[PDB]
Design a protein around this ligand. Structure first.
Ligand SMILES: *[C@@H]1O[C@H](CO)[C@@H](O[C@@H]2O[C@H](CO)[C@@H](O)[C@H](O)[C@H]2NC(C)=O)[C@H](O)[C@H]1NC(C)=O
Lengths: 49, 50
């Protein structure tokens, strides 16, 4: 089934691109880290006031 | 209503110790395009600094 398997693989990769390029939430785990750090710094700066 | 203080010239694009109407700090004074309203003398940052 090598040809079938290669075709399914190639298709699956194309699906990954379609998901990643259109679903912003797909990378929420990394964006959340950035957001937490940004909040920590914004909080720290605002405290100066 | 300001005290008996003699003003000096303003020097731009260099680190200076400034005093504007009693407001002091250290920094570089540069030209800007900030649209202050006729009644606004000072602008502020997130930290409430000038
Ligand atoms: C196993 O499933 C795959 C699909 O996941 C079958 O391959 C498809 O077969 C149809 C015809 O019935 C074609 O129109 C598709 O283009 C084929 N897909 C791919 C990726 O080649 C495969 O025939 C099935 N095998 C068995 C034994 O049932």
């Amino acid at each position: 089934n090598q040809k079938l398997i290669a075709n399914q693989f190639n298709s699956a990769i194309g699906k990954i691109q379609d998901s990643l390029s259109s679903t912003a939430s797909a990378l929420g785990k990394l964006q959340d880290v950035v957001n937490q750090n940004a909040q920590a710094l914004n909080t720290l700066v605002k405290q100066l006031s | 209503v300001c005290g008996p203080k003699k003003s000096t010239n303003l020097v731009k694009n260099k680190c200076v110790n400034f005093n504007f109407n009693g407001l002091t700090g250290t920094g570089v004074l540069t030209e800007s395009n900030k649209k202050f309203l006729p009644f606004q003398q000072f602008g502020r940052d997130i930290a409430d600094t000038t």
